[PDB]
């Protein structure tokens, strides 16, 4: 069944699962032509495939060349996503393959199901949650590797840095979703929060700053303020 508020703790049990977000696979800028018509120019995208228990992120970079000469790109993007996820699963040892794949958008269900026909025991699940994974391209190191890519490429990250040494995966995922929600609602403010205190650096092998436990509580508070604020600045409350 669908993944929602009520079965959120299932994300952190010992059954391997992956979130798949396709919202940054097909990315375009819209511009005017010399004749005054409108056209798109594709830019590099990425599939965001995340193990929420371990933080392992399989970032499949989608190079603009995959769109060359193709029609109905937004539809193709869903099938390309499903093909790459299926290829990823097939590349993993049997004991690392997921038991469930949760897609963040319902339009991915049929493409993924058809591509995973060889894996009848892998459950493909939607979610009722409005998850903020689109904001992954607001993480500077992820954005940089996607935009610099000259060819299709898979890059492996741990999106939790070393947090699991000190917190649970429930707490890690909740922190991640809070950071990404903040970045999605007001990227500039969210980014000011994370970096303005300059003494707290980002290790070369990390994505986020090296906050202490205490500093994370302050940061998380500031992100929650941000999200409520922007909710007022938007709704006038």
């Amino acid at each position: 069944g669908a993944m929602n508020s009520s079965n959120y703790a299932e994300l952190f049990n010992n059954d391997i699962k992956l979130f798949v977000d396709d919202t940054n696979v097909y990315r375009v800028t819209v511009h005017k032509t010399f004749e005054g018509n409108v056209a798109t120019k594709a830019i590099n995208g990425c599939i965001f495939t995340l193990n929420p228990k371990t933080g392992h992120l399989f970032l499949k970079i989608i190079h603009t060349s995959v769109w060359a000469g193709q029609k109905r790109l937004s539809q193709l993007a869903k099938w390309k996503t499903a093909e790459e996820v299926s290829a990823l699963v097939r590349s993993l040892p049997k004991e690392e393959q997921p038991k469930q794949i949760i897609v963040t958008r319902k339009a991915m269900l049929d493409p993924l199901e058809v591509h995973m026909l060889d894996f009848p025991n892998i459950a493909i699940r939607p979610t009722e949650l409005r998850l903020p994974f689109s904001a992954a391209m607001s993480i500077d190191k992820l954005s940089d590797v996607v935009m610099k890519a000259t060819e299709p490429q898979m890059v492996l990250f741990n999106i939790y840095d070393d947090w699991l040494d000190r917190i649970s995966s429930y707490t890690a995922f909740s922190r991640l979703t809070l950071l990404l929600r903040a970045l999605k609602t007001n990227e500039e403010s969210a980014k000011m929060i994370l970096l303005s205190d300059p003494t707290i650096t980002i290790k070369s092998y990390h994505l986020w700053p090296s906050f202490t436990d205490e500093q994370w509580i302050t940061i998380e508070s500031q992100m929650r303020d941000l999200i409520l604020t922007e909710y007022g600045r938007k709704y006038n409350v």
Partner: protein
């Protein structure tokens, strides 16, 4: 012209013969149906006046034997049987005709409805969908489930329709995932037509039989099967032109014959709106689209 004799009518029942029907009262002197057109399969079907639950009936072809109906008071239903003694049978029928205790198959001369509904339906194919090889005729009722329903429980009493599943390895070539899912022509033309049915006539025969079981017995799995076979054609970009023209005629007469008051349960909104307005064949079913729009505009 052929005849199906009834030994008697001990319980009040509505008796159908193809698209016709009449009410027989308890112990009314009714002894069967005469003047049945030769050349077509036929169905004789029953709904008891006390228990409208379970419509049931028999598909048969008078060319394949002499058949009659006799009520079984133990199993509680009208059973079809074969009379192997031809002389006895002609004699029985002649006596009942002389006493005018039979209804006449009430076919209007101009009317091709039954031909149009059974054009591709053959007894031999019916008997492979309804397995009961000791009889020349086939029993069907409202509750029988299909082999595909049983996969998702008594196999001897199943409707062995050809399984169609759009999200299945049979339907989707490795490496053609998107292509084959969005354009089912491979599955229609190679897998089903060339591979399984052999020709479009057998495909249409199964489609027509499924519709008729849905209409006459309210058989839900048959309705699923009918819509699946329609959708498979409509979702194929590449269909022989003769098949599309024949499909339009087939569906036209099915929609024309459907009791107006059963459309809500027997017509799947999604399939029909998809087939008539979104599918590759949205422009290829002119007669069917016109009758659907004038008779069931609400569904659409």
């Amino acid at each position: 012209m052929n005849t199906v004799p009834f030994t008697s009518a001990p319980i009040e029942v509505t008796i159908g013969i193809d698209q016709y029907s009449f009410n027989v009262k308890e112990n009314q002197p009714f002894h069967g149906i005469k003047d049945i057109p030769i050349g077509h399969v036929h169905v004789i079907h029953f709904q008891h006046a006390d228990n409208s639950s379970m419509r049931y009936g028999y598909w048969f072809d008078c060319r394949m034997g002499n058949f009659y109906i006799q009520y079984d008071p133990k199993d509680g239903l009208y059973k079809m049987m074969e009379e192997r003694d031809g002389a006895k049978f002609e004699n029985i029928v002649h006596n009942f005709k002389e006493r005018q205790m039979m209804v006449s198959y009430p076919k209007i001369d101009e009317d091709d409805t039954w031909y149009n509904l059974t054009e591709f339906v053959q007894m031999d194919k019916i008997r492979k969908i309804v397995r009961k090889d000791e009889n020349q005729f086939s029993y069907v009722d409202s509750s029988m489930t299909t082999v595909q329903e049983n996969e998702l429980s008594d196999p001897a009493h199943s409707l062995n329709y050809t399984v169609i599943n759009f999200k299945s390895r049979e339907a989707i070539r490795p490496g053609h995932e998107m292509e084959d899912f969005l354009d089912k022509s491979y599955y229609l033309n190679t897998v089903m037509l060339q591979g399984i049915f052999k020709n479009s006539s057998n495909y249409f025969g199964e489609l027509q039989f499924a519709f008729l079981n849905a209409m006459f017995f309210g058989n839900y799995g048959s309705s699923l099967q009918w819509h699946a076979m329609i959708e498979l054609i409509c979702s194929s970009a590449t269909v022989p032109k003769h098949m599309l023209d024949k499909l339009d005629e087939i569906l036209y007469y099915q929609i024309k014959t459907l009791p107006e008051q059963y459309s809500d349960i027997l017509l799947n909104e999604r399939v029909w709106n998809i087939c008539l307005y979104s599918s590759f064949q949205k422009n290829s079913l002119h007669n069917t689209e016109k009758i659907m729009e004038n008779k069931y505009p609400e569904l659409l």
